From a paper:
Well-ordered crystals of Rap1b and Rap2b were obtained and the structures were elucidated at 1.9 Å and 2.0 Å resolution respectively. Rap2b has two dimers, formed by subunits A : B and C : D, in the asymmetric unit. The four subunits are similar, with the root-mean-square deviation (r.m.s.d.) between superimposed Cα atoms ranging from 0.5 Å (subunit B and D) to 0.7 Å (subunits A and C). An overlay of Rap1b and Rap2b subunits matches 71 Cα atoms with a r.m.s.d. of 1.4 Å. A disulphide linkage (Cys54–Cys120 in Rap1b, Cys41–Cys101 in Rap2b) tethers α2 and α5 together. The Rap1b dimer uses almost 24% of the accessible surface area of a subunit in formation of the dimer. In the case of Rap2b the value is 20%. Surprisingly for proteins with such low pI values, the striking surface feature conserved in Rap1b and Rap2b structures is a crescent-shaped basic patch on either side of the dimer. It is possible that such a basic crescent, if present on toxin-binding Rap proteins, may contribute to orientation of the partner during binding; conversely, it might contribute to the lack of Ssp binding by Rap1b and Rap2b. Additionally, Rap2b shares slightly higher sequence identity with Rap2a (23% identity for the mature proteins) than it does with Rap1b (20% identity).
Residue numbers in the entry:
A (entry chain A): 20 to 119
B (entry chain D): 18 to 119
The structure:
């Protein structure tokens, strides 16, 4: 696990941290929330980014947790909102600001 | 409409990987609400995929096995969220994708 995590780029660790945080902040389930948050903590430990990437990323993760996208078909799409952080330009611009 | 407008610029591979992760989240969670959310999400990605259905029957297997991976972290508890996100960078996800695109 330590092995697979060490294979990830810094951009991937960050995106995974963002998605994980968003899942935890959106989910109804305390079980799932603490799974999501434990998972976010694992990515965070390996990041070489400074703390402000994560203070700014947390607000983005929360904004995506609350986006409440509606699709054709009634119901929540939080999983989709949270996964969109894998490829969202807002996530990439915070990452770019703090990585070089 | 706007959701698909928003997914239409995503690559076929990124659509497939998000479907995988979404299925994996749904299968691993013990909350029926999180499960239905994840499954509804998965279907949105499915809708824009041009892959044959064999890619999704093979991918479902992969997703359920990642949902049952049960990695242990340095803290006590499940890491299903991390196991499902690992499908975004898994060799297997990419090779299955390639096998059914061309």
């Amino acid at each position: 696990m330590e092995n697979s995590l060490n294979a990830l780029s810094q951009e991937a660790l960050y995106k995974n941290w963002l998605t994980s945080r968003c899942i935890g902040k959106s989910t109804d389930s305390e079980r799932t929330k603490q799974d999501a948050f434990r998972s976010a903590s694992a990515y965070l430990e390996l990041s070489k980014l400074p703390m402000d990437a994560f203070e700014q990323g947390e607000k983005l993760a929360e904004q995506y947790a609350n986006k409440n996208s509606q699709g054709s078909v009634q119901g929540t799409y939080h999983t989709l909102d949270c996964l969109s952080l894998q490829n969202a330009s807002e996530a990439e611009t915070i990452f770019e600001r703090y990585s070089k």
